[PDB]
Every structure is written in C-alpha cells, then in structure tokens.
Design a binder for this molecule. Sequence first.
Ligand SMILES: CCCCCCCCCCCCCCCCCCCC
Lengths: 162, 100, 54, 467, 129
Amino acid sequence: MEFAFYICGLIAILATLRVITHTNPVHALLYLIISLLAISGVFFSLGAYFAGALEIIVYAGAIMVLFVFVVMMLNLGGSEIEQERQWLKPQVWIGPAILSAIMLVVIVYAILGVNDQGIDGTPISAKAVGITLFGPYVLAVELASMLLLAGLVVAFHVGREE
Amino acid sequence: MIPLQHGLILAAILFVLGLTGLVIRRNLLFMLIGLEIMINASALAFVVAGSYWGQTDGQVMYILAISLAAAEASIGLALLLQLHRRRQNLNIDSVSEMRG
Amino acid sequence: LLKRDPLNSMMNIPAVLSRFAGKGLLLSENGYLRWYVASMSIGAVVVLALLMVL
Amino acid sequence: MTITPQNLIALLPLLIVGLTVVVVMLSIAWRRNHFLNATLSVIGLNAALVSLWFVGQAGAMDVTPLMRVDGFAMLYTGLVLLASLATCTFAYPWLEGYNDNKDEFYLLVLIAALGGILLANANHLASLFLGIELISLPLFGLVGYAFRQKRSLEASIKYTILSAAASSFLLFGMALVYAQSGDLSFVALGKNLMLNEPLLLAGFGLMIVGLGFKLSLVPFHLWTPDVYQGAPAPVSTFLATASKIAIFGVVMRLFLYAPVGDSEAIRVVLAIIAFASIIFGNLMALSQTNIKRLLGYSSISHLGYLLVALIALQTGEMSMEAVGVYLAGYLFSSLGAFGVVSLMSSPYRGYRGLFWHRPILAAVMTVMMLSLAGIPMTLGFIGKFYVLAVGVQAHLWWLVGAVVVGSAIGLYYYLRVAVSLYLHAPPSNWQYSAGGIVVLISALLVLVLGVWPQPLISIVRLAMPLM
Amino acid sequence: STEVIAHHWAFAIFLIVAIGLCCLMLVGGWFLGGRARARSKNVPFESGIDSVGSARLRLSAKFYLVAMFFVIFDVEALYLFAWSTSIRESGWVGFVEAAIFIFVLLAGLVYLVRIGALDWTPARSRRER
Ligand SMILES: CCCCCCCCCCCCCCCCCCCC
C-alpha cells in the first residue's frame, strides 16, 4: 500500500513539473491527465475510493473541454510552440523559483512540526460520504448547487459570440 | 501506517508547482491549468487530512473543492474565449492598460 | 534669513515624505496580473515566516 | 441532529433569496423582461429584509453543524441585503443603456446576496469557504458584465485569476488546519491544546492570505483599484459594500469563536498587516485623479481601520460593537459615494463642477467625502472614534498612530475631491429618481447618525451573539 | 484475509497481461511486413489532391458553450452519485433535499434551453420550411 501511494505521488510530482514547463499544449494536457490519474491512485491508496473515483470521473470531462478549447485556438503548428518558447527565459523562471522553494520549505517545516499516528488506510465507502453529505451537511449541498448555477450563468453571459 | 506528513508534503509540492506554473507562464490557458493544479492540491491535502482522522469531512471538502474548480474553470474558459475573440492572442501581460 | 519661514518648511517636510512615499508605492500598481500573483505569493511567504519566527 | 421547523423559521432570508433566485430564473426563461425581473429581485430582497424580523422573533440557534444564527448574523445579513438592494437600484438605470441582455445582473446580485447571508450565518469552515466562493463567482460575472468594454474584461480576468489563487491558498490552509485539529467547527480550533503549533499557525496564515485578498489587505491589495475601476459602477458599489461586510463579519466570527485568537503571533502579524494596510492605502490615493481607484485605496484604508478594531477583540468586549458601527457607517458612505458615481455613469454608453448642473448629487458626494474622512457631524467619525477607543483600551499605540496619520492623508484627498465638486467646469425617469432618493437618504442617515449616534449604538449592541 | 490479496493479484495480472498483449501485437504489427516507398506516401489524405494550407489550423467548435455547461452538469451528476448510494439511510428529509437539488437542476436546464443556449445550429440548418 506504501508502494502504490509513493509511486503515484512521484508520478504526480513529475507529471505536474512536466506540465508547468512545457510548450506543447496537447502534451501538457496529456501529462495533466497522467498527474490526475496519479492523484486518484494516491486517493485510492488512502482508502478514499470515492475521491479517486470522482477525480477520474469528473476531471476526464474537465480536461476534455480543455482539449476542445486547445484545438479551438492554440493549435497552429510550430508557431504557437515558438511563441510560447520566447515567453520562457532562464531569468523569467528563475525569478519565482526561489520564492516557490522558500514557500515549500516553510510549509514543510510547518508539516513536520505536527504529531503523527499514521494513516491506517481503512476504506471509506461512498455510502458514508453520501450519508454525511445529505445528513449533517445540507446547506453545503444546496448552496453548492446555487454556486454551480451561478458559474453556469456567468459562463453563458461571457461565452456568447454575439 | 502511512504518515500524514508525507501526504501533506506531496500536496504542498503540488501546490507550489501549480503556483510556479501560475506565475512563470504567460499564456492564460497555462495559468488556468496551474490554478487547476493548486485546487487539486488543496483538495488532495483535504483528503489526506480526512483519511488521517478517518472522517468523511475531507471527502466532502474535496467534493466542494472540485465543484468550485469546475465552476471557476468554466468561468475562466469563457473569459479566455472572450479575450481571444476581442484580442486574437492569449498574452496576459498585455492586460495592463489599467495602472497607477 | 528667516523670511522664508524655516519652521514652516521643517513642518512641511513630512508632507513631502508622504508624497514621495505615495508616488513610490504607486509604481507597484503596474497593472500586470503575473506580478499580482507573485506579490500574493511574496506576502504569503512573509506572513508564514513571521508566524514561524514567533 | 435533524432539521426542525424552527430551524427553517431561522432560515428565512436564505430560503427567500434562494426562492427568488429560482423565480427570477424561471421568469427570465419565460420572457426577457428587464422591469419584471428587476422588480422580482427587489421584492425578494425586501422580503428577506422583513423576514429578519421573524428571525429575530425566533431566537439564536445553531442551525446546522454549519450555521449559527444570532444578532450578529442578523445585523450582517441586514447590511448585505441593504447593499444588494442599493446595487439593484443603482444598476437599473445603468442597465437601461445596455444593448445586450440586462436580466442576468439581478440573478447574479441575488446569488451574491445569498452568499453574503451564508457568510453572515457561518459557524463552520465549510460554510466559510462556500460563502467566500459564492460571493466571488457572481462577482466574476458582474465585474465582466460589459465585456465589450476593455477595462471590464481586464478587471474580470484579473479578479477571476487572483480570486481563484486566493481560494486555493485558503483551501490549502483549511486543509492544514483540519489535519492539525480534526474538526472543522469554529469552536474546536485548538481545543486539544501550548496554543502555538506550526501546522495550525501556517494553516491560519494561509486563510489569512485568502481573507486578506478578499478584504483588500496589504500585500494582497493590488487588485482593488484595477477591479474597482474596470467593473461597472453598481458592481463597484456591491464589491465595496457587501463583499467587504460579509467577509469581515465571518472573519470576526472565526477570530472570536476560536481559541486561536488568543495566540500572540497571529495578533502581531495582524497588527503588521493593519499598519501596512492603513499607511499604504492612504498614501496610494494621494495623487489619484480617478474616483474609482481613489475609492479602492479608501476601501483598503477602511479595512485596515476595521483590522485595528478586530485585533483588540480578545482584550476588550467593546470591539464587536465598534466594528458593527464602523461597518454601518462605511456601508452608508460607500453607498452614497458609489451611487453618485453610478448615477453619473447611467445610462451605460459604449466630477469637477458637479454642483452647477447636479447640485443634490454634489451635496451627497461632499457629505460622503466628509464622512469617509472621519470628520465629525458624520457617521464615519463615530466609527473612527470607536476604532480609536478600542485601540486605546487595549494599548495599541502604533495602530492608533497609523490611524491618525492615515486619517490626515485621507482628509487631504477627500477634501480635495470635495472642493473639486464646487469649482468651475470649462434621468427624467423615476428609476433615476429612486437612485437619487437612495443616495439622499444615505447622506441624511450619515448626517443624522453623526449628530445623534445613540440609536445606532442601541441597535448594534442589541445584535449580541453568544459570548 | 486471503480473498482480498488474491483479488488484488488477479486485478494486477489482468492489467499487466492486457498492457503487455497490446504492446506485443503493436510490436508484431510494426516488425512484420515489408515497407512501401512512394513520392506522396507521407502526405495527409485529402481525397487525392493536395491540401490548402494544413490541418493545424484553429477550428471554431460551436459547442464550446455546451462544453462549459457539461462540466457543471457533470458535477451535479457527481452530487447525485453520492446521494443515490445512500437513499434508504438518508430518509424522507434527504429525499426533500435531493428534490430541491434536482428542481434547481431542471430550473437551470430550462433556463439554458429557453434563452437560446444549447442551440448552436445555423439558421440554414434549422430545418425550417
Ligand atoms: C512585464 C512584467 C513582468 C512581471 C514579472 C514579475 C515577476 C516577479 C518575480 C518575483 C521573485 C521574488 C523572489 C524573492 C525576492 C525576495 C523575497 C520577497 C521580497 C522581500
């Protein structure tokens, strides 16, 4: 169980790093799919089967429309990759790299300072998540439905051609 | 049996990688991709937090996190389509006429 | 020597300091989004470091 | 624990705003009629405002694992409902000139009012996060409502990207806090504690980053003049009033109900953020020629003053009423100023010497400019006096010195705008008249509660939550 | 127990043999059979005449609005996935919450249908008259 979690975590880290430092949009989307598959594998190793199930179910459709928009605008041959290459320079990425590194080491210092007892890996079924979702957490569900409705209304209002 | 610290460190690494892709990348689509990476990393940290305590609260917070992720992705995708329609490029540094 | 009112200029010094500080701070509002995200990250690092040192 | 009918009695504004959201949706889908859906939104908001009376007659109850309703939630719900009503009233004459559809504006305003009410009633981390996002997303829609205009699209893109980043920061800090404590309730943060542990402190710092973005706090304040200028003027009114009121109310609920507020490090970093916010927001508006960016820096400074009033909450018991009085005065002054701006920007096509063609709007604008400066005979002075008393009581001398310096700088630029209203420059419809009446009652309320502030003190002190 | 590790091993062997079989037939297809040489072999197929431009042009999909609605409706679907597995223990009150949820879902769907969204077909292709 440790092996699957650690291999999926390493794959997720590598695929995210390849995502943020790539010029090809379709290859970046493929590595993003790989990273989210690895994230769902991490979820499955921790016993949260529903979390990994929703990570593959709803993000396969999310990156699908990302592919649709990439085909819609970004694909132009080598010109788009060449234009994306000029925006990335050694100073340009070395600027915020040390900021991300110092933030990461501060958060790691924070993480290591807490007590630990180990994750037992006991599976949590979708039945318990459904009971808690429609039980103690009513208003989260209802106002999340209203939030998604609001986002849908915003998408309709902005995304019209004419 | 699996340490909580390693899962939180993994989530932190993914979060700072998403922020690196948010800052250093100039095309708006990669900023939205990096935003998706941070929201997935925060959701992942919530699932590790819920799995350490053996509660469904982390999974419910993950559900809310990805509902927000989907809604913000649709809104940002519509805004990016508007930007590409009325500018014909996805340079985010040209959005600077409002200053001072 | 005193007809220029030196005490008035001495007390008008912090008005000049306020104007200079405001004009210096207005240079940070260049209007770039990536700079805004970088400044948010900088502020997060700063507040986290201040919480760790105390 | 289950839901009792008394819980839905206490849930009246949320249910009414959701019902009128659905009703406005169905009326828009039936036929695109601007006046009908506008009247429906105003009717629903007024119905929630008068259902606040039945909520008060019900009592204070912990309605959910999520929500808690008391006088605190009642007062902030009333403030955000008044802000939403004024936003609709200012928006209708502006929307009369919109060539595109004018019906989604009121739907987004109603959904954002629902998010503000849920933020006012929040007693859980999940409720706090959902309320923040439910404030932010209709603001993404409303800021970029006139996407044909370049600046509105600029502000929409900037606000969306920055607020998604801040939501990610806040959610990661939330996850770290939940990993530390194990309960997401507002009363169980650190109950197992030796109150200073690095994971809980880092989580609260990241939530501080997110909320300080949402409260225009330094150094997460750079979006405020840009988003305020780019957005439409009723959207600027709503973002200045309702979002700030709701997010600061839930911030005070979190920092009062949790035992983490007793920690010295969070108080120290909040004092640093408040000092920087006051000085930076006042200094940045010295040479501002545009009224929207000036009011954005004004919002930064006033949220810094609110931060000073919030820092001393653990020591003195009079900080909460100070924040309530300051937020009422700030709401009225911002409503008046942004309403004058909106009425000057209406109808939508695409302030020097304003007294010589529009004298009543100039009078309202100069009254609100006097009020925002903390000058007596106005409500902003009463709020500044409360903030100064709270800072003096808990011995925060750097903060009150910063308040005095920032008040002097605000005096300079506010009074510059006030005299520029009266220098020499080189409608006809009852909705515009309704907006003029709204800003006139705002100015009259500011003047009357500056002369005689005691009824507002009584109403604010009667809005007393569980100590 | 023993059944669980047996099932895990069976699933792992299923994955490994499936991927290895796909790779093996790909390798066998690539290695067997002689190659062909032609002047126009490495040209995209466009019914026998050279292309105008290339196939890497940007193509305006008309259903992008439906796509960014599809993400939202997929999230509503995941909420109903979570509800539907625990209907009996949720009780009638949970049925009331889900009824309100689904009523808001159809209200949004009727709103999308009526305002002209979910309709991207051209005027000549609307089958009028
Ligand atoms: C054309 C405009 C381009 C704007 C790019 C902005 C890039 C910002 C990079 C910031 C890097 C900071 C590294 C750490 C500095 C020291 C710590 C913070 C300040 C105290």
